From a paper:
Although nsEM and 2D classification were sufficient to identify the predominant epitope specificities elicited by [name] [name].664 immunization, we also attempted cryo-electron microscopy (cryoEM) and 3D reconstruction of complexes from one of the serum samples (rabbit 3417, PB1) for a more detailed analysis. We first calculated a single 3D reconstruction of the entire dataset by using CryoSparc (Punjani et al., 2017), which included a heterogeneous mixture of [name]-Fab complexes, resulting in a ∼4.7 Å resolution density map. The [name] [name].664 portion of this “global average” map was very well resolved, and further 3D classification and refinement resulted in four reconstructions that were resolved to sub-nanometer resolution. The main conclusion from the high-resolution analyses in CryoSparc is the high-quality density in the maps that corresponded to the GH1 antibodies, suggesting a structurally homogeneous mAb population. Notably, in HCDR1, HCDR2, and HCDR3, the loop lengths of the polyclonal average appeared to differ from that of 10A, consistent with some variation in loop length and heavy-chain usage between these and 10A. These data suggest that the rabbits might have biased light-chain usage that preferentially targeted the GH epitope, whereby LCDR3 made the majority of contacts with [name] in a lysine-rich loop directly above the S241 residue. Moreover, connecting densities between the glycan at position N88 and the light chain suggest additional direct interactions. Although the epitope-paratope regions were well resolved, for the C-terminal end of constant region 1, the 10A fit became poorer and densities become more diffuse, probably as a result of a slight difference in the positions of their C termini. Here, in our high-resolution cryoEM analysis, the close resemblance between the averaged polyclonal densities and the structure of mAb 10A, isolated from a different rabbit, again suggests highly convergent responses, even at the molecular level.
Residue numbers in the entry:
A (entry chain I): 520 to 551, 568 to 664
B (entry chain D): 22 to 234
C (entry chain C): 21 to 237
D (entry chain F): 32 to 58, 66 to 141, 150 to 185, 185A, 190 to 309, 312 to 321, 321A, 322 to 398, ...
Write the structure that this text describes.
């Protein structure tokens, strides 16, 4: 298919293109006056920064190097009330994103500590065995 | 709307069909479209043209082989190339607005793509066995056999007899020729009835007067 | 591009019943979906446009619903005149953003079950000119009947398996009935070899047998 | 048993966002300066099945970026250029009487002055033809019209001002959504959405009254007035067909050169070869009538269909909007388009030659801090273009839904950018996301 082709399908189907989607995060600036060239430079910086922020989070979460990961963090069901198959099989991921959008910072803090800092503590205990 | 240009053509032929508007013109803006339908099958969209600027849209199987054109304020054409037997169909033109279906259609023109040569029909009378007693009701008819291409038109008494008339759908035989029958129910008081059998592809029109016994 | 799936492929409804015909789009077309009626031998006729707007002069028993991806044509109180094939049509193009009428659904045939009517049965021996051509067509007609019939051909009491072509008119718009032409085609020498030509038309519990002898006609 | 929310990456997400646009082009011209990076001939549009997206015209800031990007270019092209401030010396003048067509009388003046040689200690008599538009009387002798305003400059005539398409590309991690729907209202959702990482070129070309060389409407003439009830708003009009226009500068222009300092050539207008004639533009009369009929049909969509529609002579105000203007052929022109609007519309030979004017001192945009001389261009100017739309306004205070009238108007270049940019919006890709799973993390 091509970039963003997954916008036409439900969240489960969107998984098929995830490696495609990652292709354009740094792409299109690969080949190359204050006017424009300074703008280009700003764009280059922006693309890099955003990319790094995501990578940073994944490294925190331990999900680095993967487009799919398996966190150990349970979520508070109040954030959504739909059967799991009823979510994954009938909406564009973006639509789902709008529903989740007011809980996202809760989740991120949980990922950082409720499992990853804690896991690391346990990892250290295992390291001492 | 009336389509014109259909008929029998050989595989590999090109053909141009014309759609002619009457009672209105492209001083107003429309989509004019061509739709086809093979015998016994469903409607198949070919192309539309926006009459204001001739911008055109095509089905995937049509672009590269069919061309739609606005040739005047009352005509749109469909040029067809490299025709095959599978292009045999009734071709309709239709008129639509933006987003509001197609409310006006032509009657369609029949395109037959075949290696066979045109063949006029043989017409045979259909009547009951000479023997049986004179009956009050009597159904008489015409068997129209062995023609190519479709269509034939069958009328009775030059179109002045149509009550009691049943014209059956044609049947394509294994040979690729067509047969059809038309019957009319009359009474013993009726005068003889005559079927008029026109086959425009061959420019034939045959009469056959049928009366019992 | 967008695929239009129409279901069911055929449906039977009694006069007065309700029938619902569905059309699915693989991508959303919002409300840009039209519905057509087609009688055999006629061009299609617009019924509904923009999913639910009624076209001029279309009886109120036709209605349309749906939006995005799923649509329904409902006929509420089916009549014999409604025996036809119905098509949905996509009226929007995602690529171009334009709203021309384009791809059709595969179509749904609606058969209408009316009052039972027993056929009149007619057999026609071949005119004399047929034989000289070396081919003979015997015609049997079952006129004005509902529901469907069975036609059996016999020749000197032997059932005929080959050479038979059947042609059935569309259901009558007033009383739902059919008419049937059944033809038996033989070479002229087959036909002269044998004596008794029989058309048997069966409907339900009743058969009507019409026969002739080659020599008597 | 209870579900765990877990990480996913690269899932599509769109956020409305603004980033600086990246310039690119096919393959010195002011508009590209050849500094834009050349781009691939691979407009790989991706149709987005089953999606819709809101697009709001007049909300996109790509328009604003374009509006200031071109300004920066304009100034950049002129910063290298030589100042003309020696020209504020007063001038003696006469009306030119040599082979003047009667309707050209007093259009040009022949004048002279005592301005300096390139030597610090010497001066020379100088003279040139001038348009009356570029001068004012020194008292009730003349002076340049802008000597009481920021100084006039000009050099570097070699640079071309002819438009070249300019493409803009999203920064990596961003994409440009577009709407293909031929029926699109300037605002709200569109079902036709597809995307590109970059866009097709758009010319920098400007007009003060009619759009030129714009993309044609896909189906029918269309109007985008914003909330139409507010008549302070400019009314966009987009033709779905081209209207050819031809124009000329019939005078055989000649050129003179002057030294005003070391290294400082100064252009001056040579005597015209042949009879003096007015600049003019030809359009089809018949076509103009036909396209107006298309327009009024569109106007009626917001009114009862028996309403009266009228066009009118410009209401005046500054010349830059009072008349149509363009830089075609590398030289500025203005014309009296009011004849085009001399009609009314009711329920139920083949061409026109508009008069025109030329001014060599250009005050760009709305700015008053700068001005520049336009160099003479030798020979007859010829111009051919497609008219693609109108900038219109409507008179306030109408009653009983009738006799609405319109005039050419606007002239803020921003609306020209909008005539193309309304098709697009910029969004940000947010590949990160999470969703519930039956999975729980594996043991270390
Ligand atoms: C262009 O310029 C114009 C000129 O100024 C701008 O004006 C705006 O025009 C638009 C569309 O024409 C309006 O949108 C619609 O407005 C009405 C009125 O909204 C008010 O009334 C609410 C109560 O309404 C009901 O009761 C009243 C009678 O008392 C009836 O008239 C109504 O019909 C209703 O039955 C009231 O609750 C609102 O205030 C509340 O909400 C606002 C937030 O929006 C808060 O600030 C307030 O404090 C307060 O809490 C308000 O006072 C609505 O009735 C419309 O709702 C329908 O349409 C929506 C989409 O169009 C849809 O989402 C709704 O659910 C609802 O749709 C229903 O009804 C339709 C038929 O009426 C059906 O087709 C539909 O399927 C469904 O059944 C809608 O919101 C603007 O209100 C109006 N501006 C102002 C200031 O009023 C215009 O904005 C400019 N446009 C552009 C593009 O620039
Ligand atoms: C709506 O859009 C349309 C389409 O973009 C615009 O239409 C075009 O607009 C431009 C600008 O008005 C016109 O360009 C001018 O055309 C002049 C003529 O060009 C052709 O003829 C000449 C001989 O007269 C040939 O030499 C040219 O050959 C070149 O082009 C063809 C392609 O068409 C190539 O195959 C060739 O290899 C050549 O590359 C043309 O066939 C042209 O003279 C003029 O260029 C001069 O002026 C520019 C500065 O403006 C200089 O950069 C340039 O070097 C030329 O100047 C020389 O000549 C003058 C004297 O004549 C000297 O004084 C100079 O010092 C220098 O020596 C320019 O390109 C174009 O023709 C026109 N198209 C048509 C179809 O009419 C509309 O403008 C546009 N409207 C809006 C509002 O923007
Ligand atoms: C839009 O369309 C309108 C109308 O079609 C245009 O408005 C007219 O513009 C022209 C030129 O700009 C005006 O004429 C100029 O008038 C001055 C002075 O005129 C006065 O004296 C006249 C006798 O000398 C008398 O006839 C005039 O009477 C008219 O005007 C009054 C309104 O003020 C009205 O009541 C009357 O009934 C008459 O209609 C008036 O009292 C004159 O000095 C000018 O002549 C000089 O310049 C011209 C060249 O332009 C030159 O040829 C001469 O030799 C002389 O040097 C000139 O005639 C006219 O008055 C305007 N009409 C109105 C009603 O004001 C408008 O121009 C268009 N728009 C644009 C942007 O152009
Ligand atoms: C831009 O468009 C405007 C209209 O859309 C133009 O308005 C015109 O202005 C000019 C110059 O001021 C006028 O021309 C003068 O008119 C007088 C009288 O004309 C009428 O009467 C004479 C007899 O006196 C008759 O012969 C003509 O046909 C007229 O009926 C003449 O005496 C002058 O010689 C000269 O032509 C126009 O009259 C006026 N238009 C109208 C409709 O009144 C405006 O001038 C335009 N600007 C440019 C620069 O062209
Ligand atoms: C438009 O969006 C809808 C959902 O938003 C998509 O609907 C899906 O369409 C497909 C094909 O038309 C359906 O697939 C089929 O399902 C049967 C049922 O098991 C399966 O056996 C077949 O092999 C086939 O895959 C699907 O049921 C349907 N609904 C979903 C996925 O929820 C549609 O695909 C979208 N169109 C485009 C172009 O993306
Ligand atoms: C250019 O300057 C010269 C002087 O530098 C002007 O000639 C003088 O003109 C004034 C009045 O017109 C006289 O009082 C002087 O006597 C003149 N000078 C000489 C040497 O005779 C000349 O008029 C200026 N030209 C313009 C167009 O202003
Ligand atoms: C530049 O000065 C000129 C005058 O030299 C100003 O022109 C005035 O323009 C208005 C409108 O045409 C007339 O009412 C005045 O009589 C003109 N003045 C004169 C001197 O002719 C113009 O306004 C000045 N610009 C600046 C920015 O002040
Ligand atoms: C503008 O002027 C040119 C020529 O002066 C016109 O071009 C003509 O176009 C037709 C149509 O293809 C040709 O048959 C002619 O031969 C062309 N003329 C010449 C001299 O080559 C053009 O039509 C004019 N446009 C308008 C709107 O008037
Ligand atoms: C614009 O078109 C007009 C005519 O359509 C041209 O005017 C003609 O000019 C010649 C010589 O100048 C005359 O012999 C004709 O009689 C004029 N025609 C009419 C109808 O008056 C004019 O040259 C064209 N200008 C441009 C730049 O194309
Ligand atoms: C502008 O005026 C100047 C003088 O005021 C004219 O210059 C003369 O031009 C003629 C013919 O070109 C020559 O024979 C003279 O020798 C020139 N005089 C000087 C002092 O150079 C000029 O011709 C005028 N130009 C126009 C277009 O009217
Ligand atoms: C404008 O006029 C000038 C001269 O009046 C023209 O220049 C001529 O150009 C041709 C070919 O380039 C030469 O053979 C002539 O000798 C030139 N004339 C002179 C007096 O030197 C010029 O061509 C005209 N402009 C146009 C567009 O034709
Ligand atoms: C005015 O615009 C029209 C339409 O954009 C141009 O005609 C097009 O010409 C190109 C190249 O010759 C063709 O590929 C297009 O198919 C034409 N358009 C149509 C609708 O068929 C025309 O060239 C433009 N005018 C000028 C002077 O370039
Ligand atoms: C769910 O979360 C809400 C607030 O986020 C909290 O008040 C509630 O106690 C939680 N309950 C469970 C069962 O997680
Ligand atoms: C998010 O919160 C805002 C305001 O608190 C609310 O308006 C919106 O509906 C919420 N949406 C979701 C998906 O939680
Ligand atoms: C020059 O023209 C103006 C009007 O166009 C006139 O007032 C002036 O008297 C003229 N001067 C000469 C010397 O011809
Ligand atoms: C555009 O908006 C107007 C008013 O909001 C509406 O009447 C019209 O139907 C819209 N256009 C389309 C194609 O839906
Ligand atoms: C313009 O066209 C309209 C109708 O299309 C007509 O009534 C009118 O006379 C035309 N204009 C001219 C100047 O002939
Ligand atoms: C305007 O006329 C059209 C006929 O094309 C009609 O459909 C529409 O309802 C009318 N609108 C008004 C406001 O009268
Ligand atoms: C419109 O132009 C005509 C000539 O084509 C002229 O007779 C009339 O005066 C003009 N209209 C106005 C309001 O001046």
């Amino acid at each position: 298919l091509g970039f963003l082709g997954a916008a036409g399908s439900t969240m489960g189907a969107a998984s098929m293109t995830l490696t495609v989607q990652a292709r354009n995060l740094l792409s299109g600036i690969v080949q190359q006056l204050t006017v424009w060239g300074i703008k280009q430079l700003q764009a280059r910086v922006l693309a890099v920064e955003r990319y790094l922020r995501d990578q940073q989070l994944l490294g925190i979460w331990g999900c680095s190097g993967k487009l799919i990961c398996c966190t150990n963090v349970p979520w508070n069901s109040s954030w959504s009330n739909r059967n799991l198959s009823e979510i994954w099989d009938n909406m564009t991921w973006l639509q789902w994103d709008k529903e989740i959008s007011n809980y996202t910072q809760i989740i991120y803090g949980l990922l950082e500590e409720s499992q990853n800092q804690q896991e690391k503590n346990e990892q250290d205990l295992l390291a001492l065995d | 709307l009336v389509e014109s240009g259909g008929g029998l053509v050989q595989p590999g032929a090109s053909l141009t069909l014309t759609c002619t508007a009457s009672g209105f013109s492209f001083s107003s803006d429309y989509y004019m479209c061509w739709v086809r339908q093979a015998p016994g099958k469903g409607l198949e969209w070919i192309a539309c043209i926006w009459t204001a600027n001739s911008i055109s849209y095509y089905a995937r199987w049509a672009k590269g082989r069919f061309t739609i054109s606005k040739t005047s304020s009352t005509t749109v054409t469909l040029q067809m190339t490299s025709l095959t037997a599978a292009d045999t169909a009734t071709y309709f033109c239709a008129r639509g607005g933006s987003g509001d279906g197609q409310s006006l259609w032509g009657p369609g023109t029949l395109v037959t793509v075949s290696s066979g040569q045109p063949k006029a029909p043989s017409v045979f009378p259909l009547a009951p066995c000479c023997g049986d007693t004179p009956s009050s009701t009597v159904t008489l008819g015409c068997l129209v056999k062995g023609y190519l291409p479709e269509p034939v038109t069958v009328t009775w008494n030059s179109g002045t007899l149509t009550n009691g008339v049943r014209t059956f759908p044609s049947v394509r035989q294994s040979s690729g020729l067509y047969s059809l029958s038309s019957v009319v129910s009359v009474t013993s008081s009726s005068q003889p009835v005559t079927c008029n059998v026109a086959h425009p592809a061959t420019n034939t029109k045959v009469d056959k007067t049928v009366a019992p016994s | 591009d967008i695929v239009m799936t129409q279901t069911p492929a055929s449906v039977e409804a009694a006069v007065g019943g309700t029938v619902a015909i569905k059309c699915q789009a693989s991508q959303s077309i919002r409300s840009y979906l039209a519905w057509y009626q087609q009688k055999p031998g006629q061009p299609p006729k617009l019924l509904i446009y923009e999913a639910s707007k009624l076209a001029s002069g279309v009886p109120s028993r036709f209605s349309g619903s749906g939006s995005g991806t799923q649509f329904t044509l409902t006929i509420s109180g089916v009549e014999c005149d409604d025996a036809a094939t119905y098509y949905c049509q996509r009226n929007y193009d995602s690529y171009s953003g334009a709203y021309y009428p384009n791809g059709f659904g595969g179509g749904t045939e609606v058969v209408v079950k009316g009052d039972p009517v027993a056929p009149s049965v007619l057999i026609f021996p071949p005119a004399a000119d047929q034989v000289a051509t070396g081919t003979v067509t015997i015609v049997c007609v079952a006129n004005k009947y509902f529901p469907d019939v069975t036609v059996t051909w016999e020749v000197d009491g032997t059932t005929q398996t080959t050479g038979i072509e059947n042609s059935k008119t569309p259901q009558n718009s007033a009383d739902c009935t059919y008419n049937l032409s059944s033809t038996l085609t033989l070479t002229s020498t087959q036909y002269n070899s044998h004596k008794e030509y029989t058309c048997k038309v069966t409907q339900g519990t009743t058969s009507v047998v019409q026969s002739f002898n080659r020599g008597d006609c | 048993e209870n579900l765990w929310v877990t990480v996913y990456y690269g899932v599509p997400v769109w956020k409305d966002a603004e980033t600086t646009l990246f310039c690119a082009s096919d393959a010195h011209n002011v508009w590209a300066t050849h500094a834009c990076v050349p781009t691939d001939p691979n407009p790989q549009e991706i149709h987005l099945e089953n999606v819709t997206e809101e697009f709001n015209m007049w909300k996109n800031n790509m328009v604003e970026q374009m509006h200031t990007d071109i300004i920066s270019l304009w100034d950049q092209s002129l910063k290298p250029c030589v100042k003309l401030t020696p020209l504020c010396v007063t001038l003696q003048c006469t009306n030119v009487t040599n082979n003047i067509t009667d309707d050209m009388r007093g259009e040009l003046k022949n004048c002279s002055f005592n301005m300096t040689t390139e030597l610090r200690d010497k001066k020379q008599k100088v003279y040139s033809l001038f348009y009356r538009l570029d001068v004012v009387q020194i008292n009730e002798e003349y002076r340049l019209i802008n000597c009481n305003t920021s100084a006039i400059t000009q050099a570097c005539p070699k640079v071309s001002f002819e438009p070249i398409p300019i493409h803009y590309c999203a920064p990596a991690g961003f994409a440009i959504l577009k709407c293909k729907d031929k029926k699109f209202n300037g605002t709200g959702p569109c079902p036709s959405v597809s995307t590109v990482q970059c866009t097709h070129g758009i010319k920098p070309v400007v007009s003060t009254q009619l759009l030129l060389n714009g993309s044609l409407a896909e189906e029918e003439v269309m109007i985008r007035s914003e909330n139409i009830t507010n008549n302070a708003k400019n009314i966009l009009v987009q033709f779905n067909t081209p209207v050819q226009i031809n124009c000329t500068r019939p005078n055989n222009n000649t050129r003179k050169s002057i030294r005003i300092g070391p290294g400082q050539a100064f252009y001056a207008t040579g005597d015209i070869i042949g009879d003096i004639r007015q600049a003019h533009c030809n359009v089809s009369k018949a076509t103009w009538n036909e396209t107006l009929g298309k327009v009024v049909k569109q106007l009626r969509k917001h009114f009862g269909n028996n309403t009266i529609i009228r066009f009118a002579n410009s209401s005046g105000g500054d010349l830059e909007v009072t008349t149509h203007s363009f830089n075609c052929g590398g030289e500025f022109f203005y014309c009296n388009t009011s004849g085009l609007f001399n009609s009314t519309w009711i329920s139920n030979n083949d061409s026109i030659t508009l008069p025109c004017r030329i001014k060599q001192i250009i005050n760009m945009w709305q700015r008053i801090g700068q001005a520049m001389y336009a160099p003479p261009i030798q020979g007859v100017i010829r111009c051919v273009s497609n008219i693609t739309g109108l900038i219109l306004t409507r008179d306030g205070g109408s009653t009983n839904s009738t006799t609405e009238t319109f005039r050419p108007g606007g002239g803020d270049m921003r609306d020209n950018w909008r005539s193309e940019l309304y098709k697009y919006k910029v969004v940000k890709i947010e590949p990160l996301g999470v969703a519930p799973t039956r999975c729980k993390r594996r043991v270390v």
